[PDB]
Amino acid sequence: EYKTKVSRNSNMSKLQAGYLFPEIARRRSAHLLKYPDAQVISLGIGDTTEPIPEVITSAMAKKAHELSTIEGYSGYGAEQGAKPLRAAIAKTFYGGLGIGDDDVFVSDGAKCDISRLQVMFGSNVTIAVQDPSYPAYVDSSVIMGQTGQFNTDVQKYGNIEYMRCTPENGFFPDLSTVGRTDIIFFCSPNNPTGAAATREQLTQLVEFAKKNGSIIVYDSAYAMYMSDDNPRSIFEIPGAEEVAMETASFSKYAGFTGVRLGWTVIPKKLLYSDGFPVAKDFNRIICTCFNGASNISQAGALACLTPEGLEAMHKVIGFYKENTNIIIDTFTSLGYDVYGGKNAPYVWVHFPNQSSWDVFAEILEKTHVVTTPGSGFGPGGEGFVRVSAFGHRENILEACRRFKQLYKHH
């Protein structure tokens, strides 16, 4: 066979396996081949299941109709997003925190912003991540050339600072033990653990970044699931504007997982070591590497940020939070150490003395319920399984009765 003379990107060669979530989808497919008549329930991939509120879909259909009229048609938008949407996001989520409309960058979702940030930072930065955390932070770091090879002894890529988050430290890094890096990816409420950092912990985080001269990339994708009285934005911490940016999404708020709309906030006072503002480089990336979020998606997001939209999102979130309660009560009743599930739609269940991939396979095999193994989120996730609360109510209730059946003699 003919082959080109182009070398494969050696950073792609570093990746130890495929992306976690497509692999979960594939195991579930293999399970259906083995058990063709199984009624599979997915509590694995964190994918919204309830319809989008009518107030929000109406706005999107209205925008679609407008695009077929002379007066309503619009072509390219500013890559940073429509000014009224940037203004609505700035006021609704960061009002009083010193964020202007021009600090807000509208994206087609937080996953894409993470990779665009990584392009901006480039191959020469070192990163820290929570261990465990959402696998896109690590995988994007490897792809950008920020890492060494994968070490199978410790299940870690070289040159990444994995900050262990455990029951024994309250799922917050012991920062006095964390080495200095350029970037710190920090998700709160955390995926997979569900842990939301307190005001005091986030204060420690900002102070740590300030003394180390690091940039925090704060992922607030689940902030609106907060029940405890903890900050929802890193910008609630005085000083955060000198060291932090924030990335968020409508995915888990309005069910926009397939619609695609998020944003990133980069404050004016965030500067590189030579004094150059980080936001100006991000702006170059988004003007060169992106052509803006869909105009229909932006219209839907604008409708979210109204009294009626906010009420609708609250009801959606509240529904998934009640699912979470059902799951937590189930595992606690079965005698498990169960974590998260208070400030997040994920429950983090401790399966000590077992490998999480084995627990995943056992649950799927015996109950036909898909979960997510903790080790897919890094080596600190080993011994845990993440259970997602996104599902129809009857599906959650049925999943929990299957768990009860399975685990009654444990």
Ligand X SMILES: Cc1ncc(COP(=O)(O)O)c(CN[C@@H](CCC[C@H](N)C(=O)O)C(=O)O)c1O
List residues binding ligand X (CB under 6 A).
21, 45-46, 76, 109-111, 134, 187, 191, 219, 221, 249, 251, 257, 262, 291
Burial of 233 (0-12, 13-18, 19+ CB in 10 A): buried
Q: Is the dihedral angle over the CA atoms 367, 368, 371, 372 positive or is it negative? A: positive
Place of tokens 């704060």: 218
Distances in whole angstroms, Cα of residue 131 to Cα of each of 108, 209, 248, 363: 26, 18, 20, 24
For the bound state, the minimum distance from the C-beta of residue 206 to ligand X, rounded and expressed in Å, comes to 20
> What, of a copy of itself, ligand X, none, does residue 124 touch, CB below 5 to 8 Å by kind?
a copy of itself
Cβ distance to ligand X smaller for residue 20 or 353? 20
> What, of a copy of itself, ligand X, none, does residue 5 touch, CB below 5 to 8 Å by kind?
a copy of itself
Residue 191 is assigned to a ligand binding site: yes
The structure tokens listed for 128 are 């820290």
For the bound state, the minimum distance from the C-beta of residue 278 to a copy of itself, rounded and expressed in Å, comes to 8
> What, of ligand X, a copy of itself, none, does residue 34 touch, CB below 5 to 8 Å by kind?
none
Residue 110 is assigned to a ligand binding site: yes
For the bound state, the minimum distance from the C-beta of residue 275 to ligand X, rounded and expressed in Å, comes to 29
For the bound state, the minimum distance from the C-beta of residue 110 to ligand X, rounded and expressed in Å, comes to 4
Cβ distance to ligand X smaller for residue 47 or 236? 47
Task: Give the closest residue to 343 by CA, choosing from 205, 130, 198.
Answer: 198
Torsions phi, psi for 161 (to 5 deg): -90, 105
Task: Give the closest residue to 246 by CA, choosing from 228, 265, 232.
Answer: 265
Q: How far apart are CA 262 and CA 278, in angstroms?
A: 19
Residue 377 is assigned to a ligand binding site: no
Residue 29 is assigned to a ligand binding site: no
Amino acid at 122: G
For the bound state, the minimum distance from the C-beta of residue 163 to ligand X, rounded and expressed in Å, comes to 15
Annotated binding site for pyridoxal 5'-phosphate: 76, 110-111, 134, 191, 222, 249-251, 260, 291
Annotated binding site for substrate: 19, 46, 111, 134, 191, 291, 386
